[PDB]
Design a protein around this motif. Structure first.
Motif, PDB file in Angstrom:
ATOM      1  N   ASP A   1       0.867  -1.204   0.000  1.00 26.42           N
ATOM      2  CA  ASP A   1       0.000   0.000   0.000  1.00 26.42           C
ATOM      3  C   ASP A   1       0.894   1.241   0.000  1.00 26.42           C
ATOM      4  O   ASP A   1       1.576   1.533   0.998  1.00 26.42           O
ATOM      5  CB  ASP A   1      -0.901  -0.077   1.234  1.00 26.42           C
ATOM      6  CG  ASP A   1      -2.019   0.932   1.270  1.00 26.42           C
ATOM      7  OD1 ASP A   1      -1.782   2.084   0.869  1.00 26.42           O
ATOM      8  OD2 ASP A   1      -3.108   0.538   1.728  1.00 26.42           O
TER       9      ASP A   1
ATOM     10  N   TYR B   1       0.564   4.913  -0.067  1.00 27.20           N
ATOM     11  CA  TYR B   1      -0.346   6.058   0.048  1.00 27.20           C
ATOM     12  C   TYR B   1      -1.729   5.840  -0.533  1.00 27.20           C
ATOM     13  O   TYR B   1      -2.284   6.716  -1.196  1.00 27.20           O
ATOM     14  CB  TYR B   1       0.327   7.370  -0.463  1.00 27.20           C
ATOM     15  CG  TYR B   1       1.584   7.696   0.294  1.00 27.20           C
ATOM     16  CD1 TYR B   1       1.523   8.382   1.475  1.00 27.20           C
ATOM     17  CD2 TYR B   1       2.837   7.286  -0.160  1.00 27.20           C
ATOM     18  CE1 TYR B   1       2.674   8.656   2.209  1.00 27.20           C
ATOM     19  CE2 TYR B   1       3.999   7.581   0.554  1.00 27.20           C
ATOM     20  CZ  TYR B   1       3.894   8.235   1.761  1.00 27.20           C
ATOM     21  OH  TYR B   1       5.010   8.595   2.506  1.00 27.20           O
ATOM     22  N   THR B   2      -2.251   4.630  -0.292  1.00 29.13           N
ATOM     23  CA  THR B   2      -3.533   4.075  -0.709  1.00 29.13           C
ATOM     24  C   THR B   2      -3.520   3.366  -2.060  1.00 29.13           C
ATOM     25  O   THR B   2      -4.505   2.687  -2.393  1.00 29.13           O
ATOM     26  CB  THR B   2      -4.760   5.021  -0.650  1.00 29.13           C
ATOM     27  OG1 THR B   2      -4.771   5.956  -1.741  1.00 29.13           O
ATOM     28  CG2 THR B   2      -4.872   5.688   0.697  1.00 29.13           C
TER      29      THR B   2
ATOM     30  N   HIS C   1     -13.561  11.891  -0.076  1.00 29.23           N
ATOM     31  CA  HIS C   1     -13.043  12.110   1.277  1.00 29.23           C
ATOM     32  C   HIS C   1     -13.008  13.605   1.574  1.00 29.23           C
ATOM     33  O   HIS C   1     -12.916  14.438   0.667  1.00 29.23           O
ATOM     34  CB  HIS C   1     -11.622  11.510   1.303  1.00 29.23           C
ATOM     35  CG  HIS C   1     -10.989  11.408   2.632  1.00 29.23           C
ATOM     36  ND1 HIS C   1     -10.347  12.465   3.226  1.00 29.23           N
ATOM     37  CD2 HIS C   1     -10.807  10.348   3.436  1.00 29.23           C
ATOM     38  CE1 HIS C   1      -9.822  12.069   4.360  1.00 29.23           C
ATOM     39  NE2 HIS C   1     -10.106  10.790   4.524  1.00 29.23           N
TER      40      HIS C   1
ATOM     41  N   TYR D   1     -11.571   8.056  -3.543  1.00 29.91           N
ATOM     42  CA  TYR D   1     -10.740   6.869  -3.363  1.00 29.91           C
ATOM     43  C   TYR D   1     -11.245   5.655  -4.152  1.00 29.91           C
ATOM     44  O   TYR D   1     -11.565   4.589  -3.588  1.00 29.91           O
ATOM     45  CB  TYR D   1     -10.530   6.594  -1.856  1.00 29.91           C
ATOM     46  CG  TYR D   1      -9.541   7.563  -1.271  1.00 29.91           C
ATOM     47  CD1 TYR D   1      -8.189   7.306  -1.341  1.00 29.91           C
ATOM     48  CD2 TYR D   1      -9.949   8.786  -0.695  1.00 29.91           C
ATOM     49  CE1 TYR D   1      -7.245   8.203  -0.889  1.00 29.91           C
ATOM     50  CE2 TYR D   1      -9.013   9.683  -0.230  1.00 29.91           C
ATOM     51  CZ  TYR D   1      -7.674   9.396  -0.340  1.00 29.91           C
ATOM     52  OH  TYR D   1      -6.761  10.315   0.097  1.00 29.91           O
TER      53      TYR D   1
ATOM     54  N   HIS E   1     -10.789   2.317  -1.688  1.00 32.97           N
ATOM     55  CA  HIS E   1      -9.846   2.362  -0.554  1.00 32.97           C
ATOM     56  C   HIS E   1     -10.181   3.530   0.370  1.00 32.97           C
ATOM     57  O   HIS E   1      -9.306   4.163   0.943  1.00 32.97           O
ATOM     58  CB  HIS E   1      -8.379   2.383  -1.061  1.00 32.97           C
ATOM     59  CG  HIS E   1      -7.303   2.046  -0.075  1.00 32.97           C
ATOM     60  ND1 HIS E   1      -7.116   2.762   1.080  1.00 32.97           N
ATOM     61  CD2 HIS E   1      -6.221   1.242  -0.186  1.00 32.97           C
ATOM     62  CE1 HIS E   1      -6.018   2.354   1.690  1.00 32.97           C
ATOM     63  NE2 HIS E   1      -5.446   1.425   0.942  1.00 32.97           N
ATOM     64  N   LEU E   2     -11.478   3.801   0.473  1.00 27.21           N
ATOM     65  CA  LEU E   2     -11.931   4.839   1.389  1.00 27.21           C
ATOM     66  C   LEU E   2     -11.949   4.326   2.823  1.00 27.21           C
ATOM     67  O   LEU E   2     -11.461   4.996   3.756  1.00 27.21           O
ATOM     68  CB  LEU E   2     -13.348   5.341   1.027  1.00 27.21           C
ATOM     69  CG  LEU E   2     -13.844   6.522   1.859  1.00 27.21           C
ATOM     70  CD1 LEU E   2     -13.108   7.819   1.541  1.00 27.21           C
ATOM     71  CD2 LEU E   2     -15.335   6.670   1.660  1.00 27.21           C
TER      72      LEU E   2
ATOM     73  N   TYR F   1     -12.230   0.614   5.511  1.00 26.00           N
ATOM     74  CA  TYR F   1     -12.232  -0.798   5.736  1.00 26.00           C
ATOM     75  C   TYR F   1     -13.639  -1.335   5.837  1.00 26.00           C
ATOM     76  O   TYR F   1     -14.550  -0.669   6.360  1.00 26.00           O
ATOM     77  CB  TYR F   1     -11.558  -1.144   7.050  1.00 26.00           C
ATOM     78  CG  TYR F   1     -10.075  -0.945   7.174  1.00 26.00           C
ATOM     79  CD1 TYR F   1      -9.195  -1.303   6.190  1.00 26.00           C
ATOM     80  CD2 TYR F   1      -9.525  -0.452   8.374  1.00 26.00           C
ATOM     81  CE1 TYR F   1      -7.834  -1.184   6.363  1.00 26.00           C
ATOM     82  CE2 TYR F   1      -8.179  -0.352   8.553  1.00 26.00           C
ATOM     83  CZ  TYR F   1      -7.311  -0.740   7.554  1.00 26.00           C
ATOM     84  OH  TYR F   1      -5.961  -0.661   7.749  1.00 26.00           O
TER      85      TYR F   1
ATOM     86  N   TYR G   1     -11.747  -2.831   2.542  1.00 25.61           N
ATOM     87  CA  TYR G   1     -11.666  -2.472   1.133  1.00 25.61           C
ATOM     88  C   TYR G   1     -12.423  -3.469   0.296  1.00 25.61           C
ATOM     89  O   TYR G   1     -12.486  -4.653   0.638  1.00 25.61           O
ATOM     90  CB  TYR G   1     -10.224  -2.284   0.712  1.00 25.61           C
ATOM     91  CG  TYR G   1      -9.468  -1.299   1.577  1.00 25.61           C
ATOM     92  CD1 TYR G   1     -10.078  -0.156   2.036  1.00 25.61           C
ATOM     93  CD2 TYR G   1      -8.147  -1.513   1.954  1.00 25.61           C
ATOM     94  CE1 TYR G   1      -9.418   0.724   2.825  1.00 25.61           C
ATOM     95  CE2 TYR G   1      -7.486  -0.625   2.761  1.00 25.61           C
ATOM     96  CZ  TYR G   1      -8.155   0.515   3.220  1.00 25.61           C
ATOM     97  OH  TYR G   1      -7.482   1.401   4.065  1.00 25.61           O
TER      98      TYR G   1
END
Lengths: 231, 8
Positions: free
Chosen positions: A99, A101-102, A150, A156, A215-216, A218, A220
């Motif tokens: 991962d 940075y996302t 976000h 995301y 990936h905003l 959990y 995912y």
């Protein structure tokens, strides 16, 4: 270069456990989360959990709490996943991914294992397939059950291509950004709840399954995939 | 990078 090198295929019996490994190199192991993804035939991609090898803190998809255990060894820069109470449902290919940075931009090659939530964000891909001729352009749709925007201003949403016999590769990150190494024939747009991957001038290398992913928050979650094939 | 969640 970042490398994630997974352990070999396993042929196992029901009721047993298996432990697989993901050896990392080419970056600082203790700096980034490692996620784990399940690819089971007919069930697309499913996110299991992630671990931070610095803190050792892990987060799990509730669906895997009591099935999967994530650990890390900082001496050997290796992440591990152990599965218990193996069943036919566990036959799948399992990937580790770094991962960044996302962005899940670095993926292991997968480990094959052959066994002889209401509030979760639902990602949908209405088309099971797209059938095109080389040089055509194509659009692939995805929808999310809640906004992926976000407070920081980023949306995301991610697009991946999984070519035949290969690991997934990141194409588009945070809705519209083109990932490193990906041709600019690929582009992404969206409204925060509906999204479109556009591919111009399709070529044979573009064949495979396209997945959207959020990936905003959990756990995912991935769309069901849209298979691109040549006529 | 947060040590307890990868979520943005």
């Amino acid at each position: 270069e970042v490398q994630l090198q997974q352990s070999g295929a396993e042929l196992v019996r029901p009721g047993t456990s298996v432990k697989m490994s993901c050896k990392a190199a080419g970056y600082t192991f203790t700096k980034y989360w490692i996620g784990w993804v399940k690819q089971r035939p007919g069930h697309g991609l499913e996110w299991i959990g992630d671990i931070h090898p610095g803190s050792f803190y892990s987060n799990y998809n509730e669906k895997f709490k009591g099935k999967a255990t994530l650990t890390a060894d900082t001496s050997s820069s290796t992440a591990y996943m152990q599965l218990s109470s193996l069943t036919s449902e566990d036959s799948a290919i399992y990937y580790c991914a770094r991962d960044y940075y996302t962005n899940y931009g670095d993926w292991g090659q997968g480990t094959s294992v052959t066994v002889s939530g209401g509030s979760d964000i639902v990602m949908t891909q209405a088309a099971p397939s797209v059938s095109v001729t080389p040089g055509e352009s194509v659009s692939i749709s995805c929808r999310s059950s809640k906004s992926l925007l976000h407070r920081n201003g980023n949306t995301y949403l991610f697009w991946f291509l999984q070519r035949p016999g290969q690991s997934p590769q990141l194409l588009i990150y945070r809705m519209s950004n083109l990932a490193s190494g990906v041709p600019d024939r690929f582009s992404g747009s969206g409204s925060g709840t509906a999204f479109t991957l556009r591919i111009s001038r399709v070529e044979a290398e573009d064949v495979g399954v396209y997945y959207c992913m959020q990936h905003l928050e959990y756990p995912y979650t991935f769309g069901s995939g849209t298979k691109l094939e040549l006529k | 990078i947060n040590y307890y969640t990868s979520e943005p």
